Amino acid sequence: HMKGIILAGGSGTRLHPITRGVSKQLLPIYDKPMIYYPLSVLMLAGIREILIITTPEDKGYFQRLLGDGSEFGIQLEYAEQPSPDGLAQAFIIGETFLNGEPSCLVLGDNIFFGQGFSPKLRHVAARTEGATVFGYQVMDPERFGVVEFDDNFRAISLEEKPKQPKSNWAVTGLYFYDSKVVEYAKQVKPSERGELEITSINQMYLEAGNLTVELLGRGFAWLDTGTHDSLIEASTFVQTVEKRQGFKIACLEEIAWRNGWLDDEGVKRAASSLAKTGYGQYLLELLRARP
Amino acid sequence: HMKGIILAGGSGTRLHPITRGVSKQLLPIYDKPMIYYPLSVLMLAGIREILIITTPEDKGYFQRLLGDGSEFGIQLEYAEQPSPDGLAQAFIIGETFLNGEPSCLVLGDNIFFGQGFSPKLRHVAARTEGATVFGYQVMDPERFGVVEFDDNFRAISLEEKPKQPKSNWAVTGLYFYDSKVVEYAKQVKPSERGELEITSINQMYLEAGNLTVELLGRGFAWLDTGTHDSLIEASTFVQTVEKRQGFKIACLEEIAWRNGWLDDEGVKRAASSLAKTGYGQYLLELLRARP
Amino acid sequence: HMKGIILAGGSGTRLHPITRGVSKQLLPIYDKPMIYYPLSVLMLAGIREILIITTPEDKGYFQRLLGDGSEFGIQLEYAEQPSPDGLAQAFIIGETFLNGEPSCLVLGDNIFFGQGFSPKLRHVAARTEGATVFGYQVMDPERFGVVEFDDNFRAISLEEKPKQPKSNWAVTGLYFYDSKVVEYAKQVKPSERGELEITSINQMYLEAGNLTVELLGRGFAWLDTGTHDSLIEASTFVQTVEKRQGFKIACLEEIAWRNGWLDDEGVKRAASSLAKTGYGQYLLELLRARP
Amino acid sequence: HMKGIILAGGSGTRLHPITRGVSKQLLPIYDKPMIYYPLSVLMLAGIREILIITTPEDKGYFQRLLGDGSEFGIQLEYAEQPSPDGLAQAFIIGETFLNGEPSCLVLGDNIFFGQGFSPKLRHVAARTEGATVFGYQVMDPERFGVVEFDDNFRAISLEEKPKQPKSNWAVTGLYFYDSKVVEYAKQVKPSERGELEITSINQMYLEAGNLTVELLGRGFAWLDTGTHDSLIEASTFVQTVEKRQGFKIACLEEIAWRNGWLDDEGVKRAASSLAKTGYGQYLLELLRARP
Ligand SMILES: Cc1cn([C@H]2C[C@H](O)[C@@H](COP(=O)(O)OP(=O)(O)OP(=O)(O)O)O2)c(=O)[nH]c1=O
Ligand SMILES: Cc1cn([C@H]2C[C@H](O)[C@@H](COP(=O)(O)OP(=O)(O)OP(=O)(O)O)O2)c(=O)[nH]c1=O
Ligand SMILES: Cc1cn([C@H]2C[C@H](O)[C@@H](COP(=O)(O)OP(=O)(O)OP(=O)(O)O)O2)c(=O)[nH]c1=O
Ligand SMILES: Cc1cn([C@H]2C[C@H](O)[C@@H](COP(=O)(O)OP(=O)(O)OP(=O)(O)O)O2)c(=O)[nH]c1=O
Numbered sequence A, B, C, D: 001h002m003k004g005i006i007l008a009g010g011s012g013t014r015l016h017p018i019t020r021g022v023s024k025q026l027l028p029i030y031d032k033p034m035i036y037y038p039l040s041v042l043m044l045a046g047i048r049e050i051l052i053i054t055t056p057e058d059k060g061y062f063q064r065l066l067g068d069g070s071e072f073g074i075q076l077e078y079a080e081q082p083s084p085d086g087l088a089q090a091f092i093i094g095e096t097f098l099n100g101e102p103s104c105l106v107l108g109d110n111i112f113f114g115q116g117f118s119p120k121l122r123h124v125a126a127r128t129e130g131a132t133v134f135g136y137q138v139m140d141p142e143r144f145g146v147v148e149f150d151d152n153f154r155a156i157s158l159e160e161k162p163k164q165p166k167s168n169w170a171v172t173g174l175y176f177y178d179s180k181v182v183e184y185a186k187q188v189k190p191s192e193r194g195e196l197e198i199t200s201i202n203q204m205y206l207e208a209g210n211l212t213v214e215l216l217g218r219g220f221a222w223l224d225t226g227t228h229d230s231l232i233e234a235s236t237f238v239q240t241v242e243k244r245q246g247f248k249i250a251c252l253e254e255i256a257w258r259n260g261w262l263d264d265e266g267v268k269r270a271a272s273s274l275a276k277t278g279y280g281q282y283l284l285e286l287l288r289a290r291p
């Protein structure tokens, strides 16, 4: 049993005219609120206790949209991050929550998708001790955090915003840790930008020499929706595969269902209140079979 | 001098998993909040006094995003619609605001765009006496309120979601009314659907013979963003013409500027706070010229 | 060992201004000629002897683009269909070619794609006796040939463009036949539409009780590129998953390579002559591995 | 009265797996063959005598698709360019055709579109003597031909593939000349790449000091469809504005019609043979009016 956290705060300045009003994580990726995506990841990893960190201003909107999470058969807790001081701060803010157990942090503006992702997730979630990060092959390795490594990964360097070289495997917003995490967090100096950067915490695990690295292969898709254009690419992608290939991405009630987290009765209440929606029919359709 | 109102409430059920958290009118059409679009219309019509009607829950989000409107050189007032009882209700709720003057109602989920649009708005705006609705040839007449008319228009009929024929021109969410408007709305009774329909207010100017129709010809684009798919079509469209043809749609500060509503100094404060955005550079670029 | 045929003729009237010049099957689905797609299917089914039936006018263009097929490690033969008299005619025209062996017909304007597809093809291919058609749940049953079936399938019926009901599974342009095939095609008479329909050949295996159905489940995508809009949907789809998920669809040299049909040396000559292309680099990249 | 030429040859290597079979200019930009676009430009400029230069292999396909051009009320002549030796060669190859008159060259892979383009065209086509080129604002001024200038343009430098600076106004595939053109062409040395580059000919006019420069403003869209990705952008663009804004781009019969080049009777024969197509209905619809 492990716990999960989702950073759903931030000022989201790069989407600015828009995020001046509503939190970036409430914006839509096709037919589902953005936060539905990072959440589904944690659920595919089999994590039911999840703390969502948001700004004081957006909180009620998230609660208004997710409630206590009982609708998805999960236990949701909320916590406010007063000012956007950096990612590492999640562990400080989430100390009392994590207690002393191991965790999983997922950035709120990240979309992940590939065949047989759930397993890969579980396996890595079977690691008591250490720290795993998920790299992805980028074409623009400068404007992304890079991680080097060799057989067994281990990682030999985590040069972020490399001034010139490194490797081309960017590290995504999917992190796994262990107890020592609240520790490393408590000691972290504000970056030039001026925020407790999660990279600093990952640095420590590298030297401590227990920073394994999970490889996200070819069939895997990864996006960091935080700019006007990437927000569109994300939407268009999900819409394309959902309509073209017949399955839904980040459909929470469906993930819960199969995970035995909620009974057919539960899925039916959901599909009903969404019946007028393509998301709802997709749910009604799962309530049967073909020849 | 005329006044404008924008219906920005509603339950937005057709976009449901999403609108369970944030109002539909705060969602993005590419790089701008949806409401930026109906608003720009009123501004292109030369209207500075605008009342925005929203739900009690979303209000602060709108204020948080639009303020008093001084940033766009316009006078914004807000009012709450307790429960989504229909469109005609805007005039009831907006009585004290309209006072006795003529008005312009624009639905919050409507995107309008074409060349020469404004001149067409001013002309239709310069009228003081009657009512004015715009048609657009839809391909789904059933699913739209339709206007049959004759020479000069007038409109012999106006059948709602005509389960059968009519004509193929749908009535867009753009309307112009005179003082008799608030009078009408008070005598509208709930449709079979249970809301107070704007169509009723229109069936009244029809009979009174005071109902002119304005045709949204060929080069104009019209959308009613209220479904998951139309929300994407809208976004993709604005992104395509903005990037392909070089201008911005519904860029408020730019509309204000040319309208002499705000000085270069004003446009510069804006473009600055958006500098990290494509919307911002577009603004910086207008602050000059080419050979 | 089995043989395959690809119908790549037709008048392609629905894409008309365009197909007045070039055959529909030479048009592009993103970065590859349309015909590359039906072909890859046959290759994924492990079929190396393939007859391509084209019009007399387009022939040299196909040869000019595909040659004898040695570049993809396959044996290509060509044959001309004088006039577009229907699909069943492929077996007549292809008699001398098929000889007495079993076959596989794939329409030229069909795009197929899903995970685990091949294994499914081999299994359906390993059969020697009967007939095999694939269904895909369309949303437009009228506009498609449909298959009603029961447990194991069989198919109780097969109504063409059923002006009324049936089921919602459309018969894709992928078929498997045995020697009795050419026998059937000879006794097919022209439909009301005036062509010799493949459906007729199918109605014959139905009655004979030798007609199995293969369901193209959820993760599979299917398209019939023959209209201006579906041609765009297809392109946009392949481009999206290729760029989003990192693999190439219908990349012949790559299919050949893994099938042991062509050596690394072969793949390198190809990737070289395409080096200036994204298709080429994808090939160079397969010529190695990662940690 | 002036003459026009369209370079529709080339090896089109950047679209390679595809162009190994069919000429790039026969590929589709949505619902119309690519060549329909450059052609429409010449027609919007009011030019009826047009020479199309193609490869020996593609010729019959173009003829098969365009005939003598009488269907669009224009006089089409064809000429073969044996080997793709460069653009300047058009004037050599087209000497006997141009005779001694002034001309207009339009590259075959260029798509142009903006409101009030036709006028701008005509005006520039009213220039006997000199040479006009059309620049467009690019964001990637390196991989494009640049042109500097000041009041009256004149152009002060034509640095192509600038190793480092210049201006950001790329020059498009739309050129206008005068007699002295066959002259300048006859004397041109093969570039490093190894082809008679049109840029070399434009150089001469700059020094001769009679190389005016037409400015393609904001609302204008320009694309150079010669790569897999730009081919898709082009299609998606045309499809978007055509469906979103209700008009057709590069609809030849319609351009002829208004130009008085072909009578209603002619447009009706066309719309008929395309009736099953969206292009055809668009034509039937122009054969009337609304209230
Ligand atoms: C900086 C910060 C980010 N976040 C969230 C926001 C994102 O979902 C995710 C990644 O941060 P970013 O992707 O940087 O998003 P952002 O909110 O910082 O906005 P921008 O950089 O464009 O101005 O982490 C917090 O929850 N708290 C924080 O202090
Ligand atoms: C019914 C109603 C709509 N509106 C707004 C919402 C829309 O922008 C616009 C048009 O109404 P709709 O487009 O119908 O939107 P909606 O909010 O009713 O949601 P849905 O029909 O999908 O369930 O009017 C109000 O502001 N108050 C209302 O009572
Ligand atoms: C009718 C016919 C089709 N074909 C091919 C064309 C297609 O790839 C495939 C399916 O036929 P269609 O998809 O019908 O294509 P088509 O060429 O008939 O053109 P349209 O219906 O739009 O006018 O079979 C032949 O090869 N020979 C034929 O006689
Ligand atoms: C080089 C050349 C190009 N053309 C045409 C092709 C194009 O429409 C246009 C522009 O040339 P390009 O855009 O360079 O096209 P291309 O055919 O050279 O192919 P690529 O560069 O990708 O390998 O001019 C000729 O007609 N004859 C020629 O000799």
Ligand SMILES: [Mg+2]
Pocket: A109, A224, A225, A226
């Ligand atoms: Mg981010």
Ligand SMILES: [Mg+2]
Pocket: B109, B224, B225, B226
């Ligand atoms: Mg609506």
Ligand SMILES: [Mg+2]
Pocket: C109, C224, C225, C226
């Ligand atoms: Mg077909």
Ligand SMILES: [Mg+2]
Pocket: D109, D224, D225, D226
């Ligand atoms: Mg080019």
